[PDB]
Design a binder for this molecule. Sequence first.
Ligand SMILES: *[C@@H]1O[C@H](CO)[C@@H](O[C@@H]2O[C@H](CO)[C@@H](O[C@@H]3O[C@H](CO)[C@@H](O)[C@H](O)[C@@H]3O)[C@H](O)[C@H]2NC(C)=O)[C@H](O)[C@H]1NC(C)=O
Ligand SMILES: *[C@@H]1O[C@H](CO)[C@@H](O[C@@H]2O[C@H](CO)[C@@H](O[C@@H]3O[C@H](CO)[C@@H](O)[C@H](O)[C@@H]3O)[C@H](O)[C@H]2NC(C)=O)[C@H](O)[C@H]1NC(C)=O
Ligand SMILES: *[C@@H]1O[C@H](CO)[C@@H](O[C@@H]2O[C@H](CO)[C@@H](O)[C@H](O)[C@H]2NC(C)=O)[C@H](O)[C@H]1NC(C)=O
Ligand SMILES: *[C@@H]1O[C@H](CO)[C@@H](O[C@@H]2O[C@H](CO)[C@@H](O)[C@H](O)[C@H]2NC(C)=O)[C@H](O)[C@H]1NC(C)=O
Ligand SMILES: *[C@@H]1O[C@H](CO)[C@@H](O[C@@H]2O[C@H](CO)[C@@H](O)[C@H](O)[C@H]2NC(C)=O)[C@H](O)[C@H]1NC(C)=O
Ligand SMILES: *[C@@H]1O[C@H](CO)[C@@H](O[C@@H]2O[C@H](CO)[C@@H](O)[C@H](O)[C@H]2NC(C)=O)[C@H](O)[C@H]1NC(C)=O
Ligand SMILES: *[C@@H]1O[C@H](CO)[C@@H](O)[C@H](O)[C@H]1NC(C)=O
Ligand SMILES: *[C@@H]1O[C@H](CO)[C@@H](O)[C@H](O)[C@H]1NC(C)=O
Ligand SMILES: *[C@@H]1O[C@H](CO)[C@@H](O)[C@H](O)[C@H]1NC(C)=O
Ligand SMILES: *[C@@H]1O[C@H](CO)[C@@H](O)[C@H](O)[C@H]1NC(C)=O
Ligand SMILES: *[C@@H]1O[C@H](CO)[C@@H](O)[C@H](O)[C@H]1NC(C)=O
Ligand SMILES: *[C@@H]1O[C@H](CO)[C@@H](O)[C@H](O)[C@H]1NC(C)=O
Ligand SMILES: *[C@@H]1O[C@H](CO)[C@@H](O)[C@H](O)[C@H]1NC(C)=O
Ligand SMILES: *[C@@H]1O[C@H](CO)[C@@H](O)[C@H](O)[C@H]1NC(C)=O
Ligand SMILES: *[C@@H]1O[C@H](CO)[C@@H](O)[C@H](O)[C@H]1NC(C)=O
Ligand SMILES: *[C@@H]1O[C@H](CO)[C@@H](O)[C@H](O)[C@H]1NC(C)=O
Lengths: 438, 438, 438, 126, 126, 126
Amino acid sequence: NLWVTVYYGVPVWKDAETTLFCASDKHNVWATHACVPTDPNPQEIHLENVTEEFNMWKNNMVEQMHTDIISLWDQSLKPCVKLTPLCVTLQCTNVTNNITDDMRGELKNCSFNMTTELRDKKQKVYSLFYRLDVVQINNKEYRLINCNTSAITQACPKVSFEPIPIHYCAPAGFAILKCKDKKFNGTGPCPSVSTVQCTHGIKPVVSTQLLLNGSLAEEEVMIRSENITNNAKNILVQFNTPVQINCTRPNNNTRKSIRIGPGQAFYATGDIIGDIRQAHCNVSKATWNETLGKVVKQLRKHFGNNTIIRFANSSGGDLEVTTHSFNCGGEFFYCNTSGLFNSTWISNDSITLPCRIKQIINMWQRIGQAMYAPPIQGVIRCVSNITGLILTRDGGSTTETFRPGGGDMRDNWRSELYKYKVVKIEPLGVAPTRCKRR
Amino acid sequence: NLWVTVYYGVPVWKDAETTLFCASDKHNVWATHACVPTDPNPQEIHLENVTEEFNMWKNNMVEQMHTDIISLWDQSLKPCVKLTPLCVTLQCTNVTNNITDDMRGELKNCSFNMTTELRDKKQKVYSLFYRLDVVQINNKEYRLINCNTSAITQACPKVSFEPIPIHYCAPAGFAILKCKDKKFNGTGPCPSVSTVQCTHGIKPVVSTQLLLNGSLAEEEVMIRSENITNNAKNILVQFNTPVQINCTRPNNNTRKSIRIGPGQAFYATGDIIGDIRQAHCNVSKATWNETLGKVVKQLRKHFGNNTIIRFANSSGGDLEVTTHSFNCGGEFFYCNTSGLFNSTWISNDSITLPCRIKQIINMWQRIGQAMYAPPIQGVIRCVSNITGLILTRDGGSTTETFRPGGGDMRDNWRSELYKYKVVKIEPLGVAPTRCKRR
Amino acid sequence: NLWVTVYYGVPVWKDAETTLFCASDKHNVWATHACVPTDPNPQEIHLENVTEEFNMWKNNMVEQMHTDIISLWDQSLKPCVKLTPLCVTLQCTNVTNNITDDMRGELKNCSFNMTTELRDKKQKVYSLFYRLDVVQINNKEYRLINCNTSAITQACPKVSFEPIPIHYCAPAGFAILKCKDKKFNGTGPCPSVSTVQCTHGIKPVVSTQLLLNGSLAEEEVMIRSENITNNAKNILVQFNTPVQINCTRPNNNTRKSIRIGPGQAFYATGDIIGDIRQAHCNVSKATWNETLGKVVKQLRKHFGNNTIIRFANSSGGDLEVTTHSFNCGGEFFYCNTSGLFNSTWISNDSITLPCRIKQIINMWQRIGQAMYAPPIQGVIRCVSNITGLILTRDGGSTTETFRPGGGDMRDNWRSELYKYKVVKIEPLGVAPTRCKRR
Amino acid sequence: FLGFLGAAGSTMGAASMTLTVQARNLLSLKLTVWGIKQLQARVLAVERYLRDQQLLGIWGCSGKLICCTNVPWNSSWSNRNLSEIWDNMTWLQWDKEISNYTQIIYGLLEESQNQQEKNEQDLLAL
Amino acid sequence: FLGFLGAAGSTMGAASMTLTVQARNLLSLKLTVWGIKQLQARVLAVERYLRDQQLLGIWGCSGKLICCTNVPWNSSWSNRNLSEIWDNMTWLQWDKEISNYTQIIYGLLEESQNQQEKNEQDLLAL
Amino acid sequence: FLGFLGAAGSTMGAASMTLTVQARNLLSLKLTVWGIKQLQARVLAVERYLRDQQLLGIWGCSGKLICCTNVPWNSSWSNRNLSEIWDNMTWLQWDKEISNYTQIIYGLLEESQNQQEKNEQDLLAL
Ligand SMILES: *[C@@H]1O[C@H](CO)[C@@H](O[C@@H]2O[C@H](CO)[C@@H](O[C@@H]3O[C@H](CO)[C@@H](O)[C@H](O)[C@@H]3O)[C@H](O)[C@H]2NC(C)=O)[C@H](O)[C@H]1NC(C)=O
Ligand SMILES: *[C@@H]1O[C@H](CO)[C@@H](O[C@@H]2O[C@H](CO)[C@@H](O[C@@H]3O[C@H](CO)[C@@H](O)[C@H](O)[C@@H]3O)[C@H](O)[C@H]2NC(C)=O)[C@H](O)[C@H]1NC(C)=O
Ligand SMILES: *[C@@H]1O[C@H](CO)[C@@H](O[C@@H]2O[C@H](CO)[C@@H](O)[C@H](O)[C@H]2NC(C)=O)[C@H](O)[C@H]1NC(C)=O
Ligand SMILES: *[C@@H]1O[C@H](CO)[C@@H](O[C@@H]2O[C@H](CO)[C@@H](O)[C@H](O)[C@H]2NC(C)=O)[C@H](O)[C@H]1NC(C)=O
Ligand SMILES: *[C@@H]1O[C@H](CO)[C@@H](O[C@@H]2O[C@H](CO)[C@@H](O)[C@H](O)[C@H]2NC(C)=O)[C@H](O)[C@H]1NC(C)=O
Ligand SMILES: *[C@@H]1O[C@H](CO)[C@@H](O[C@@H]2O[C@H](CO)[C@@H](O)[C@H](O)[C@H]2NC(C)=O)[C@H](O)[C@H]1NC(C)=O
Ligand SMILES: *[C@@H]1O[C@H](CO)[C@@H](O)[C@H](O)[C@H]1NC(C)=O
Ligand SMILES: *[C@@H]1O[C@H](CO)[C@@H](O)[C@H](O)[C@H]1NC(C)=O
Ligand SMILES: *[C@@H]1O[C@H](CO)[C@@H](O)[C@H](O)[C@H]1NC(C)=O
Ligand SMILES: *[C@@H]1O[C@H](CO)[C@@H](O)[C@H](O)[C@H]1NC(C)=O
Ligand SMILES: *[C@@H]1O[C@H](CO)[C@@H](O)[C@H](O)[C@H]1NC(C)=O
Ligand SMILES: *[C@@H]1O[C@H](CO)[C@@H](O)[C@H](O)[C@H]1NC(C)=O
Ligand SMILES: *[C@@H]1O[C@H](CO)[C@@H](O)[C@H](O)[C@H]1NC(C)=O
Ligand SMILES: *[C@@H]1O[C@H](CO)[C@@H](O)[C@H](O)[C@H]1NC(C)=O
Ligand SMILES: *[C@@H]1O[C@H](CO)[C@@H](O)[C@H](O)[C@H]1NC(C)=O
Ligand SMILES: *[C@@H]1O[C@H](CO)[C@@H](O)[C@H](O)[C@H]1NC(C)=O
């Protein structure tokens, strides 16, 4: 004789999708102040004896992070100056003083009539626009690149672009299962599961070809792909050691405030004090070659020991996908990175990457909402780690070529949410037992 | 001896007002995607032995639906192009090429200076405006009709106005009582009450004189009024059989995209390919006469067998109330309907209703928020059923005349929420059982 | 043997901060129609034996009220006409017809080109601007004072500025502790505590130097300061009896509606019918002198019986700080309160305070969001009681001088939320009792 | 089984046969027009369900569909015979005639639970 | 003590040792992007906790972590011996094989509580 | 009857006389400034009440205003006599001086409830 016995609080969970709130330990774009204060001591419980199936390519956490990151970006651009008056004909001349050979024609000295705070009065002002932000109309006549596509909103200079780590915390009745396996590809069973209330600090770093400021693999370089035999699936590489990248903007730019209306100021670019040099990034030649030597070593596992793995540069497309686009100190660099993926592999010095600057930014691959990044005063210099790559393979029927990829920003945060999954706790369980209700 | 006994979950309800959420089974105006997915099999429970009072004229569901429809309409026009530059002087000439006699002067060929994407440049473009949208200023000079009164917002062309059925579902602890009486009036007790979680698909069809796309009476034509002896109360007729109305806009209109700013496009009307004919609706003469014969038969009950019931057309007023205004594929028709209400009743062929198109639309009887309906490419044709009428009687001291009414959109949705009622479940009850707490 | 016993519902509270909602017993700036209807009979319980520590200067209710009042002010100015076209050059002449000696140069007759409904046409309109709203540009050329600093939004004329009392009600599980001590100076133990669900009607009256239409002290004039020995801390005086002040605007102003766009109307000032006199406030000379006699009597307690207490006028600063700024009938006065604070105190007639009018208002000491108060038709007259003061002392090493203060609006509502305190009910308590669980 | 409110027209005894079916239906995004209405309905259902559960716990009847108590039924509330109530009358009619005595009945149930719980504590203390 | 879901991989008997550590973790601003996500996470937690508590109350098991009932094991749901269930198998494996018999088991618990509660009232009425 | 927190300053015994009046007051639109505040207040009240009820039910005291249990008074939490505690002292002072042993007391109640529920299930199996 067996009687149905109901138990409450049993450790049973099911895969589910839920709204994960933020926790965080000057105002940011990500509004980390609106995030609830996380606990000083995170409570992680190791789930011994447990083997749970994971899949980062079908992970809803990545998709939910993408929507939140875009929403946070959009909400910080609402109380900001709308530069619709800037869509006017510009008389741009060529910035040709104290410039080097690599910066010839990259800067434009644009003069235009501007609206004054008084509606009936005009204002002839000038500004320095990069060649990537102005397009000629057929000194010559130019216009902002977005004027025929988007309405440009100036980013508020008091809002920081710096990625502050954010922890995605599941509500009560939900748990986040951290896979603690160190040789784990994004798909398959992970027999080292643990339950943490919520994830580590995941910096929303926006980059295309190199994963900056990320989380390193514990033991060895990890090659993770949705389908390694499919050339249309991006390959996410994770480095066991960080590759430092020095990124600087040598020009000593000055922000000039142009009052374009009542309470509205358009921060233009004044003349550069000193010489004008090309923005660039150095990656150590010795460190990069060693890391590529490790990448190919774990890349031969999925392609054979006798295959020829060659690294070539980008294949073409937008400047966002063909260049290592990233944000450094409030200015958006677009670095070539053709000297990085250039060698071929068979069985003190630095690499300088010539970067280009843009101020009109169409981000998240959205057509209609452009942003003007105001100039940053002084010289910008940031030091980051390249903690991963986004490689794309080319089809073939003895050599395999891997070109850098990007574009989709979900690939950038998938490299951080690969070890996490959201489960729905089911505390009601029934089991036959000799006990009977009196 | 009798001790009180508290019972939980008793079937007791009281009349109450609550917030009913939407459920629904290209983006839509009413955002039916935001509605929760309704169950595939509705759970309807018959409440035998139960007689509940109903009143469709004091029903809060109708008032609540009116606010929701207006709010849904307002929120779909927020991320849409504001046509404030359109309020400019227009030089309009009549469209006199390949037109019939009925379209002489209805179309205006208006040319005007428009702001382009560049602030300092002007763009001389032309568009075809209907005579009902432009008002002369004293080729001649015209202006949009709303320019002294409202700020016009162009309807987003990718958002459809097609009425998708919506189910108004009460939260937990609330029930919706459905009257299954097939001879049920608008007021009084309903011997056959039933509980359903929420209502059938109620299409938010906007019309004034004829109730289109509606729900048919089960047995006979039903005449419903708040006070049948008051001529100031509208009479809501419901048809037991549907009267099919075919509405077409024969013109081959072309949508022309005029770019009035950065990221803003004003969709104008290009030249019509072919001849220009008048928009019209056909109602079958035999079918319409038969339905009026049934309406008068059910209308003599409240007015005597020897009374003379005559159908005259609408009295004076706005074009919305004097014409059968409705929406057909994104274009707003305004049909005369003077040949429908035309006869006097004593004890293959079609009726063509000449309609007029409008693009600047003021609905919900609101002054201050106009909307520009962008042109629809190609020929528009609709097939609908007239499932009811909104008649208004004229005062008198032997004949009764019934003119079509409208204007108030709540009467359009009152014809669908007449059988429904929101009640508040009260599960706590006390009874004198012999049982005594030990 | 003592086994613990858990008790639920024990009367225990702890100090906590929570969100207090509104309750209130033509639309209003503070949406009291959105406040829940308060009970007709408030339920207050006298907490005998209870001595609770209070602090008005660390009270979170004051800080929360400040955010709510600003938020209500901001949300009532969102659906209002934006007067961005008003920042145009003005040709202003002095209004010198039928004016008195005190109004020479106070009113300006400004004419300006203004945008009409049609984008391509302009209208030459005129308006009467006070000298405090226009600033000269170097008849002469003027401009609105806000036009280099803020974007001005015209206050909607249908929204009333009258302070309707609001009750700040704590949610369930929270209680509001009310000090019944009539000699309570705002800090320290309160031997007479009562618990009410929420506070009395606290009118959000906005004023700087005199606390108008407020709550009177029960027994004696109460001097309340955070640190009476610190001259940087404002002194809040509360009157046991009200001092009545009539403030009038004798000019019979006319509101002229200038249509500045589609659906946008700018309400200008037409010519005054009759003579133009100076706005002023009456204060009874006998009543005010008696009240100062009571204030100094209660002020000698904190400064000695032999000290010399002198009242001087405002030292300097903005017009909001140096004048008794307040709102009377929809127009903002700025009064010359120097005949009030003039006397020196040693051990039928009225005082006329010449006030000045402003239409461009920067509320809450915020730089960036100006407001245009539309003219009020007719003659404005309002009667109020001065129920307190905000005095500021000057440093010294035998006499003490007390100048009026203001600016910070939290001090205005601190005088109403001084007796209230928000506590968090903790209904779980453990005690040792001779029980054992079965 | 008849469903939610299936025994609405049933007699008192037949309605009490299925008190559970109505008991389980009392409890079971963006800030758009439908999102807010759907959120307000979720919070309204929770606080409404919790209010009745709190009352049952106040009277010492939590977790019981049928709970007997220890306060007398005054004949002023209703003098109808037991047979004609549970075999000839429905729950809708019961509340209609006792809607005014409900609050005083609730107060009587309130004091009985606290009084008997003091007795349970004191009797057990021995 | 192991923590929340600490005995997730432990045996059923060992998992039942700390049923409470998972029981107390099932329940525990502006309208910005994070504020709305925080609010809808609080309401979702409240509803999810209340649905399980309601089910326990429906079956007459409110306030008890372990509750015995009066509905038989049909032997088609599971014919495994008791020894290997509570000493050689975990709770996760249990729900996997009985995920489809759950609703019919729940309905049986529903009628048993109402049936015995009527019996309790009738027996006590004597 | 004194009202909500009427016996706040009364002795322990007088306060326990009317625990229910404070017990019943712990639980009982557009997105404007006041609407969101009202909604957040409602949600906060609901979750606070549910947390308190959950803590009560973890110790097996759901539905009981006075619940007496099986964990000892350590005599380091307090050594005051019963007469002076329950006749010359108030709950405010009680909580003030026992604000720090609260968590360990709660853990003791939790473990006692779990152990006694295990014992009840094992004894009932016979
Ligand atoms: C990867 O991480 C590094 C270190 O966290 C990031 O570099 C940091 O970037 C911020 C600005 O984005 C630098 O702060 C700035 O410092 C300058 C000079 O003190 C100051 O004038 C600015 O106001 C601002 O505070 C910070 O110094 C810098 N840390 C370094 C260089 O060690 C890097 O940007 C990250 N990579 C990204 C975001 O792609
Ligand atoms: C302090 O409280 C008094 C009494 O409520 C306020 O006086 C009143 O002020 C209002 C305007 O704020 C006056 O309203 C006006 O009344 C006329 C005549 O009905 C009407 O045509 C106007 O449109 C407007 O409603 C009201 O007459 C006046 N009455 C009294 C008794 O003085 C006073 O303004 C308050 N002081 C403040 C808020 O500083
Ligand atoms: C990146 O590396 C380049 C060289 O590879 C650095 O350029 C040198 O800068 C030093 C000053 O620090 C000069 O003395 C050299 O003449 C430069 N070498 C050139 C121009 O070939 C550059 O400073 C580095 N940028 C960083 C570290 O941000
Ligand atoms: C409505 O009915 C009219 C006739 O009453 C239709 O007009 C006819 O259209 C056909 C083509 O289908 C022509 O051959 C006839 O010459 C037209 N008759 C006229 C103009 O008198 C009209 O097409 C119908 N519209 C619909 C069904 O949408
Ligand atoms: C404030 O007081 C002054 C005088 O002290 C008032 O002005 C007088 O008003 C009366 C009419 O009520 C006139 O006859 C007098 O000529 C005015 N001047 C003087 C010097 O008396 C003033 O009206 C008062 N303010 C009010 C009533 O709002
Ligand atoms: C402010 O105005 C009020 C009138 O609205 C004055 O009150 C009047 O005072 C006179 C003389 O004292 C009385 O004859 C009237 O009966 C009063 N009218 C009332 C009470 O409605 C008040 O005196 C004025 N205050 C000052 C300081 O001048
Ligand atoms: C200016 O730079 C542009 C590059 O955009 C180049 O095409 C042009 O020839 C340059 N003009 C001169 C005078 O060097
Ligand atoms: C500004 O406008 C004037 C108008 O004639 C024009 O001459 C001048 O070139 C403009 N300056 C620009 C576009 O920089
Ligand atoms: C990923 O890991 C799983 C489990 O370790 C393994 O079965 C699979 O072959 C690996 N590779 C891919 C492409 O799934
Ligand atoms: C143009 O149309 C109008 C109708 O609005 C009419 O009055 C006028 O006579 C027409 N003129 C010509 C030349 O057709
Ligand atoms: C555009 O502006 C010019 C300016 O003179 C005017 O001549 C012309 O008629 C305008 N075009 C219109 C109103 O269509
Ligand atoms: C007009 O008033 C100003 C003060 O705002 C003064 O300086 C000027 O002299 C006046 N002009 C006259 C009175 O003509
Ligand atoms: C309006 O504009 C005309 C244009 O020349 C100017 O002459 C006149 O002075 C202006 N009127 C004002 C600014 O009041
Ligand atoms: C207010 O009263 C308390 C009571 O102890 C006292 O300590 C405090 O100093 C008083 N404040 C002032 C400003 O006198
Ligand atoms: C309705 O009434 C009939 C006879 O009065 C009765 O037999 C039947 O059971 C009632 N309905 C229900 C659902 O009990
Ligand atoms: C894992 O399984 C072993 C036996 O297979 C058992 O002894 C151990 O207790 C289990 N782990 C946990 C955390 O209970």
